[PDB]
Chains A and B, each alone.
Chain A
Amino acid sequence: MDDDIAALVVDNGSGMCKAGFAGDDAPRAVFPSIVGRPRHQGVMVGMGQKDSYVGDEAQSKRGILTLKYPIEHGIVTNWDDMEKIWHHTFYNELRVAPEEHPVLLTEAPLNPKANREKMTQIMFETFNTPAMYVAIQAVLSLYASGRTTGIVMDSGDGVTHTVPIYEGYALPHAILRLDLAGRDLTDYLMKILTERGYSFTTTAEREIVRDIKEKLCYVALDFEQEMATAASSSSLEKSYELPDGQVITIGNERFRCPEALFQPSFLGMESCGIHETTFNSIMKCDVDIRKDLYANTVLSGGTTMYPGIADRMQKEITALAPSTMKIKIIAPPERKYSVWIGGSILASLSTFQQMWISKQEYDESGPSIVHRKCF
Chain B
Amino acid sequence: MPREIITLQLGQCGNQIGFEFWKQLCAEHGISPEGIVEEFATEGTDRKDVFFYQADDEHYIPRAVLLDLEPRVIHSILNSPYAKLYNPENIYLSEHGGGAGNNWASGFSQGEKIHEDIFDIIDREADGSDSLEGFVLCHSIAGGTGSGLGSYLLERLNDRYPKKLVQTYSVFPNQDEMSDVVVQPYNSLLTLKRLTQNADCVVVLDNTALNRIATDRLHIQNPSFSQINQLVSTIMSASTTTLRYPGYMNNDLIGLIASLIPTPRLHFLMTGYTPLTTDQSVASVRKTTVLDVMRRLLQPKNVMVSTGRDRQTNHCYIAILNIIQGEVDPTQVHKSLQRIRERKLANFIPWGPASIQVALSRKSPYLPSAHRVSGLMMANHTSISSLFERTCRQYDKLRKREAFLEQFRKEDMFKDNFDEMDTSREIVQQLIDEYHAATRPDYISWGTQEQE
A interface residue numbers (CB < 8 A to B)? 39-40, 42-43
B299 is an interface residue with CB less than 8 A from chain A: no
Q: Given the complex, which residues of B lie within 8 Å of A43, measured CB to CB?
A: 43, 45, 365
Interface residues of B, dominant DSSP: loop
Residue B40 interfacial (CB < 8 Å): yes
Chain A residues within an 8 Å CB radius of B45 = 43
Bound complex: CA A39 to CA B365 (Å) = 11
Residue of A nearest to B365 (CB): A42
Q: Is B80 an interface residue (CB 8 A)?
A: no
In the complex the two chains form, what is the Cα distance from A250 to B365 in whole Å?
43
In the complex, chain B residues 349-375 whose Cβ is within 8 Å of any chain A Cβ? 362, 365
Taking the closest CB of chain B, its distance from the CB of A86, in whole angstroms, is 30
Using a Cβ–Cβ cut-off of 8 Å, how many residues does chain B contribute to the interface with A?
Answer: 6
Q: How far is the CB of B346 from chain A (nearest CB, A)?
A: 32
A42 to B43, CA, bound (A): 10
B contact residues around A39 at 8 Å (CB): 40, 42
Contacts of B362 in A (CB 8 A): 42
Q: Which residues of A contact B365 (CB under 8 A)?
A: 40, 42-43
Q: Closest residue to B41 on the A side, CB-wise?
A: A40
> Which residues of A have CB within 8 Å of B43?
40, 42-43
B40 nearest in chain A by CB position: A39
Q: Which residue of A lies closest to B363 (CB)?
A: A42
In the complex, A39→B39 CA distance in Å?
12
Chain B residues lying within 8 Å of A40, measured Cβ to Cβ, are: 42-43, 365
Q: Please report the C-alpha to C-alpha distance between residue A40 and residue B40 in the assembled complex, in whole angstroms.
A: 9
| Set of chain B residues within 8 Å of A42, measured between Cβ atoms | 43, 362, 365
Among A39, A42, A43, the most chain B Cβ lie within 10 Å of the Cβ of: A42
Given A39-B40, A42-B362, A43-B43, 8 more pairs with CB closer than 8 A: A39-B42, A40-B42, A40-B43, A40-B365, A42-B43, A42-B365, A43-B45, A43-B365
A40 to B362, CA, bound (A): 14
Q: Would you list 11 pairs from A and B whose C-beta atoms are within 8 A, ordered by A residue?
A: A39-B40, A39-B42, A40-B42, A40-B43, A40-B365, A42-B43, A42-B362, A42-B365, A43-B43, A43-B45, A43-B365
Q: 8 smallest A-B Cβ distances: which pairs?
A: A42-B365, A40-B43, A43-B43, A40-B365, A43-B45, A43-B365, A40-B42, A39-B42
By beta carbon, the residue of chain B nearest A44 is B43
Closest B residue to A64 by CB, please name it: B42
Nearest Cβ on chain B to A345's Cβ, whole angstroms: 46
Nearest-neighbor residue (CB-CB) of A41 within chain B: B365
Kindly provide the distance from the CB of B290 to the nearest chain A CB, expressed in whole angstroms. Answer: 21
With CB as the reference atom, state the residue of chain A lying closest to B245: A42
- The CA-CA distance from A40 to B365 in the complex, in Å, is 8
> Bound complex: CA of A352 vs CA of B323, how far in Å?
68
A177 CB to closest chain B CB, in angstroms? 36
Closest chain B CB from A233 CB (angstroms): 43
Expressed in whole angstroms, the minimum distance between the Cβ of B110 and any Cβ of chain A is 46
Within 8 A of A (CB), among B234-259: none
Q: Can you name the residue of chain A whose Cβ is closest to the Cβ of B364?
A: A42
**A203 CB, nearest partner CB in chain B, Å:** 12
- For the complex formed, measure the closest distance between the CB of A111 and the CB atoms of chain B, giving whole angstroms: 35
Separation of A43 and B246 alpha carbons in the complex (Å): 12
Within 8 A of A (CB), among B33-68: 40, 42-43, 45
Closest Cβ of chain B to A298, distance in Å, is 44
* Minimum Cβ distance to chain B for residue A311 (Å): 45
Residues of chain A lying within 8 A (CB to CB) of residue B42:
39-40
A43 to B366, CA, bound (A): 11
